[PDB]
Amino acid sequence: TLNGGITDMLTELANFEKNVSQAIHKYNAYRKAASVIAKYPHKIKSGAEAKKLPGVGTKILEKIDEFLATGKLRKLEKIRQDDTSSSINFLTRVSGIGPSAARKFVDEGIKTLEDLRKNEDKLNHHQRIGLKYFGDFEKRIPREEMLQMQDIVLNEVKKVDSEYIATVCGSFRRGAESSGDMDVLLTHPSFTSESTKQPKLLHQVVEQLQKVHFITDTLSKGETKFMGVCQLPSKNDEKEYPHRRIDIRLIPKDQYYCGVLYFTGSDIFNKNMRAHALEKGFTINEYTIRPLGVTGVAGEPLPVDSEKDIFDYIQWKYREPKDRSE
DNA sequence: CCGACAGCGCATCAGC
DNA sequence: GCTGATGCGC
DNA sequence: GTCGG
Ligand SMILES: Cc1cn([C@H]2C[C@H](O)[C@@H](COP(=O)(O)OP(=O)(O)C(F)(F)P(=O)(O)O)O2)c(=O)[nH]c1=O
Ligand SMILES: [Cl-]
Ligand SMILES: [Cl-]
Ligand SMILES: [Mg+2]
Ligand code: NA
Ligand code: NA
Ligand code: NA
Missing domain, CATH: 3.30.460.10 (Beta Polymerase, domain 2)
Known part of the structure; x- marks a missing residue:
């Protein structure tokens, strides 16, 4: 929590882009920036300092400067005041309601927890159980x-x-x-x-x-x-x-x-490791690691008899599970 | 400047 | 029905 | 939004 203020701001931005803008690349960019800053072991003093990290570019650097100077971000302050954005963001907190259904519900005036409860017949099965345990699933x-x-x-x-x-x-x-x-x-x-x-x-x-x-x-x-x-x-x-x-x-x-x-993750650790495998000429999924030929087509499964074997193929030293919380 | 950004199971729907 | 795309969530 | 080539 050295840079908890900054990483909260980037996370709220990522959620905005995913849930409201439906811009999934901005969402993954913000989450990558938040992740590289959460493990940065110094209290950040300027956007310039943060720009040095991979995944923080100019735009995020300016946002960090504003946040450091003022303690807040005007872009997020406007987003929190916008009732449509706030409604869409809230609805995606129900399991099974993603950005598309959240905006669909808001368009028809279904915008609060009460509304879902009174329109339980517009929900699919997953969404019905998500609403049923809405409070428990936040614990x-x-x-x-x-x-x-x-x-x-x-x-x-x-x-x-x-x-x-x-x-x-x-x-x-x-x-x-x-x-x-x-x-x-x-x-x-x-x-x-x-x-x-x-x-x-x-x-x-x-x-x-x-x-x-x-x-x-x-x-x-x-x-x-x-x-x-x-x-x-x-x-x-x-x-x-x-x-x-x-x-x-x-x-x-x-x-x-x-x-x-x-399954051990984290999800961002998987994205980094899988991205690195591509750079090294491999693809990794939950079943296999496979080489990619000159055509980038997945070859045949390579023999694996440990987690470490997978790290070896892509030339990463082994990281214990406790060090994969990215 | 710009293409790529990890990978996939299950639910739902549209067109046939 | 099957096939393919889209939604959602790991 | 960021970045490798
Ligand atoms: C969500 C997600 C998960 N995974 C993998 C990596 C996760 O660690 C594993 C379990 O998903 P999870 O959503 O339960 O994440 P988690 O790491 O267990 C967690 F830390 F988020 P929590 O303990 O709160 O569930 O599935 C991915 O590869 N891609 C993904 O997008
Ligand atoms: Cl995007
Ligand atoms: Cl295996
Ligand atoms: Mg989990
Ligand atoms: Na950077
Ligand atoms: Na949701
Ligand atoms: Na999970």
Whole structure:
């Protein structure tokens, strides 16, 4: 939090560009700038100083100068006064409402939390559950609660079939003292890049987690990706825990290391690392790392037997999960 | 100056 | 129905 | 919005 003021301002700008302008490159530029400044280990004294960092250019440098001189940004002060922008921004805080639906709702006079509740029939399923847990989904998850949730998930997965491996990723695997949701990577020897010798591998786990009333709602679900809602059990007379977002990603077991790399993140770390792989002539996704030929077409999967193997290919020294919080 | 910006699962819709 | 584009969110 | 070539 050395430069928390600056990185808050850049984040609010990124959200403005994504949600209101629908200019996704400005949104990623602002977030990259915010990220490179959050890890800069000096208290920034001028835009010139910040311009030296990659991702901060002239425009952001001027904005930082204004913010340092005045403590605020006039552009953001006007944005906060604009009722249309404020309405659109607020609606995207509901899970499943992105910039397009937010502007659609605002155009029809659906602009507050009450309005969504009275127009629940204009929402799709995901958006309906997002509204239902709107307040809970804004709460952070203490790591101590993440530890209880992991113990349930792993034990219930083990009960379905002892050959499953479930791995909690996200910021929890990076060591964070609090997480926004739970991200679970799942493998089973029956599911490899060569064959799926067992159907319903993800369904069986989801079902068992619903049976014990851990999973409470479903946002979306397919053969390899589940997104939904869970809740820890409370003791007698105790207030209930908040409802929590849970994502489960079933990945072919022989592709575990690209999967765990992807699911551990952060998202900006993935973007940097994947960008760097391109510069080095490779493409990385959650399944494989592949060379790119002279035509930039993805070649065949390269052998991977560790996270570090993926770093080696692109000539990065290995970074532990705790150092990928970008 | 300007092309590229990481990569992809699931939900929904439009055209057929 | 399937196919492709778009939305949304990892 | 930023930047590598
Ligand atoms: C959102 C996002 C996620 N990911 C990867 C990287 C994340 O760490 C992983 C889990 O997504 P997440 O939205 O739960 O992020 P997170 O890192 O776990 C988090 F720190 F944002 P939080 O703990 O609050 O969920 O999916 C991407 O590669 N691209 C993305 O755009
Ligand atoms: Cl843009
Ligand atoms: Cl792998
Ligand atoms: Mg997460
Ligand atoms: Na710079
Ligand atoms: Na949203
Ligand atoms: Na997640």
